[PDB]
RNA sequence: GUAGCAAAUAUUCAAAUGAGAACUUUGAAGACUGAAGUGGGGAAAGGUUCCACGUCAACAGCAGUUGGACGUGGGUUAGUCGAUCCUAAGAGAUGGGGAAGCUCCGUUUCAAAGGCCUGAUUUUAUGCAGGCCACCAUCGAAAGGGAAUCCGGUUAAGAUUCCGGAACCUGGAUAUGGAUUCUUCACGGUAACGUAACUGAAUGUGGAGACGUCGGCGCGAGCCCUGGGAGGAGUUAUCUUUUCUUCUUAACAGCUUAUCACCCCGGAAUUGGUUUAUCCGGAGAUGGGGUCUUAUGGCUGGAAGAGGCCAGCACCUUUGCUGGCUCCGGUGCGCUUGUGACGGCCCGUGAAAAUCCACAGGAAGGAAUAGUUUUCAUGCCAGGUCGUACUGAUAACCGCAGCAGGUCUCCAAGGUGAACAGCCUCUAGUUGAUAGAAUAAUGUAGAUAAGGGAAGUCGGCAAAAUAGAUCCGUAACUUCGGGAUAAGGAUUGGCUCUAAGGGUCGGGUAGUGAGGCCUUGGUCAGACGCAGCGUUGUAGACGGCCUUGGUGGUCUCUUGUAGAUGCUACAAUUACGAUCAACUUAGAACUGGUACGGACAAGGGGAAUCUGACUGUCUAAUUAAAACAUAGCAUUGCGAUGGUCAGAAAGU
């Protein structure tokens, strides 16, 4: 009943949060999620032939 | 850039005094830099076990200074030996 | 244990260091195709146990009859 | 461990039986892996080579020198240290040498020595740092550490 | 919910006393002594491993 | 210690055999000064080795 | 008959037993430990305390029918677990040398310091030589190195040992199958390398044994949460497709399975590949194709007959018999844990030996009308000796004791929460610590206090206050790293929503010749079963296999259907759909006796001086400091026939 209540986004306010951001969800693991997402998109886009080698590389290093 | 002047010796916080932190830094940079594998040409020679400088990928270990691959005394001796070898 | 082959089984029966075999019948279901027999002829002798898995009652019949009279056979 | 100068394990042969008698040296600076070390009177004057002080010209920077001939190394054995062969005399074959301490000695001409400086030099010029560095330095040489004042 | 136990009187989590936990045919969770891993036979010249050669801890060959 | 030496097991075994009270037919005999077993030892009271 | 027998929250009702019950056994409540435990094993230590029966004089600071007590018995099963073996810091014979001597030094030394194999030759089995090889005892680890075992069941008490089933290893014997052999010691692949084998002495060489620590990352197993289904149990005045629980798969064998590394083709700058972490490439990248390690997984065998969860039937005892289900998922910064590739660190670079293998090498032997090979497949035999019970501690060990002390480790559930914190529960375990009554003083351990707020006092001692998280803000001084959570503020619940942040699949459309359902067209086995003594009369539902078209939009309609879950030809070219899935932070509304880190948990802060720079260390049991240490600095001795120091002596 609490696990369903926490899915719908209750019990998540400022007074139910005794850990820091970097403890609850480490900024590193957030960055790793995001980069692996952007890396695999640029991989799919270059192999599908949406972009070529030269745009891939500059947007790889900018990502 | 994060630290003004402290650089690598930021890991020693405020302890040990400015002048000792600068004196250790000058050599902490040298021992952790990469040098030119004079066999390979490639700029990667792994310092490992002070006095030993291995090549990253041609497996060739040279014997060097504690903090630099070739010291000023070892440059002088190699030059002077080359000089007085010719007789 | 090893699972062999067929063949080799007609020579395992006559290896002369084997005394005992076993018939195990496991009514097994293939994607609800229908419940078939699944017979297993196990040859105990000497340093290993040899399993022959047969999936039809026809060949089960045929080389149950082919199993030698110079052998003990424990059915279940 | 307890010594701040690399050791060059250098494989030689056995002239009399079929072996490879492996010998443990103190690597001179510029010595590298697979390179050929030459030990004897007729050996060339290159870094790493082991020739008697008599078979060498004046002004050479030698190391791992013998006090007596047949000693097998005694002098200038530590990090970044070397002997300078000052003088000579074939008449009563005894050569003058200047030791890392700045003392002038007179050794036999048959006493050997390795050419160049011993590697690992400048090891002392970095501050050791925060006690624990000293602790770990000593822990593999001897039990002469944290000295109480009498 | 179910916890496990050593089987060789050595109660010390050293090498040669490493426990993999296993569920058995008896529906029982039990610990078994996993042996030491085998480092690969390596080239007598370079540092790299020797390809086409079984690991098998010495005396296994 | 569960991993006893046999030299300790042999002595535990003799200490077990010795641990009994006086047989109550020796009190019947002639002149018999002996009353009870004086050298009786329990695992609680006094240890050995 | 006093002090006292008051810390570990806590006991209560009934029956039974018995002379006797607060204490024993059972039932029933109520509780606690709360998986860093009062759980389940072990180490050292103990030594029979283990378990059964009989029993209560002594002991269990009350009691006693109970017991770790008392009396008599029973009990510890190994080729695979250890010891045994190897070496480590070391301890130590020997040769020798010292010493009046007890003995001391040294362990490779100023030593003549025995072992190894092939046939020989068959003198009831003894002499050869192929010849080789030698700085050389022994002891030293029940946590280091290490040949090999797993599952189920079993006892009053043992079991990785007993039983049943399956393996495996080492030591030795041997005979078949295989493989090799027309000059005989295998072939294949360009190659990395492969295959069931596929000669190989001396000697040499190399590998494994064989190793730090930490931080993130990938993978695996176990657990945790979770879905559908097949069972049982609980709740049911009302509600609940739901609360709980079973649905498991060992060693071992197979076929397969990968990061890494490597190989062939190829020749890159318009510099590309690429990690969370920036490394890599003309000593050859990307890309295309391959090779291997088998850790690890999958499937199979083990192995369902086992174990589990059931139902029906009886059975005097004591046992049963019969049948059924044991299936298919999903998920992740989860927890433990093994691990792979990396990376930070060092004036620290993180054992050795036994043991085993491989190669280099070419000694020696060996053929075809009979012989090679035991690194493979099968077959045969043997595996000794000792330990093995039990506690491992608020009652089995040490502390005079059944002592609030001390004593080394392993496994580890749910919820809240950052969390192995505190608080609550499940499994499992206890409910033991002399009790009854009454609630004076004084105590001990908890608390609260109007107003004032250190006036108390040697001194703010003791307590109070502060506290989590999010946003705002943050001074002097500084060795520019800090100070810093400075200071000083503001917000936090419930509920209903809104927003953002992903994985996989599709590529997005019409025109033939060739392949899901429905016969059709041809077509290949026939499994099984009825009734009598393998036999003969004998049911027979059908298992496989191919190639013809037609059925989503819809004229056809009071209205349709089966499969888009349908491999061929010329193609028109975007920012988009279907689908499954966690929790993170924002944002808004609504609402309450302005409450919300609601319990638990949890900084007081500031301005100065003295002093020691810092972290670290000691007066075990009155002193933790400004004392010791420390890095830094300085001085002094010494180049070995030496310096400082040891020894009675010495070939120390």
Shape of chain B: extended
Largest sheet of chain B: 2 strands, antiparallel
The share of residues in extended strands of chain B comes to under 5%
Q: From the alpha-carbon coordinates, what is the Rg of chain B to the nearest angstrom?
A: 17 Å
Helix and strand content put the structural class of chain E at mainly beta
**SSE order of chain E:** EE
| Cross-sheet strand order for the largest sheet of chain B | 1-2
Radius of gyration of chain E: 17 Å
In angstroms, what separates the terminal alpha carbons of chain E?
A: 41 Å
Spatial order of the strands forming the largest sheet of chain E: 1-2
Largest interface: B-D, 34 and 36 residues
Principal-axes geometry of chain E comes out as elongated
Taken as a percent bin, the fraction of beta residues of chain E is 15-25%
Separate helix tally of chain B: 2
- What's the assembly state of these chains? part of a larger assembly
List SSEs of chain B in N-to-C order: HEEH
Enumerate how many helices of chain E there are, as a single number.
Answer: 0
Structure summary, number of beta strands of chain E: 2
Helix content of chain E: under 10%
Largest beta sheet of chain E, briefly? Answer: 2 strands, antiparallel
| First-last Cα distance of chain B | 54 Å
Explain this structure.
Chain C: Its main location: cytoplasm. Chain C: It is found in: Cytoplasm. Chain C: Belongs to the eukaryotic ribosomal protein eL38 family. Chain C: Keywords: Cytoplasm, Ribonucleoprotein, Ribosomal protein. Chain C: This is Large ribosomal subunit protein eL38. Chain F: Belongs to the eukaryotic ribosomal protein eL39 family. This is part of a larger assembly, with chains A (63 residues), B (87 residues), C (76 residues), D (150 residues), E (61 residues) and F (49 residues). With 87 residues, chain B is mostly helical. Chain B is built from 2 helices and 2 strands. Chain B starts with 17 loop residues before the first helix and ends with a helix. Chain D is mainly β and 150 residues long. Helix content of chain D is 5%, strand content 19%. Chain D is built from 1 helix and 8 strands. In chain D, a hairpin with a 5-residue loop joins strand 6 and strand 7. The longest helix of chain D has 7 residues. Chain D starts with 8 loop residues before the first strand and ends in a 12-residue tail after the last helix. Chain E has no helices and 2 strands. A two-stranded antiparallel sheet of chain E has the order 1-2. By secondary structure, chain E is an all-beta fold. Chain E is elongated. By secondary structure, chain F is mainly alpha-helical. Chain F is elongated. The relative contact order of chain F is 0.18. Chains in contact: B-D. Chain E binds one RNA strand of 652 nucleotides through strand 1 and strand 2.
How do you describe this structure in short?
Chain E: It is found in: Cytoplasm. This is part of a larger assembly, with chains A (63 residues), B (87 residues), C (76 residues), D (150 residues), E (61 residues) and F (49 residues). Chain D has 150 residues and is mainly β.
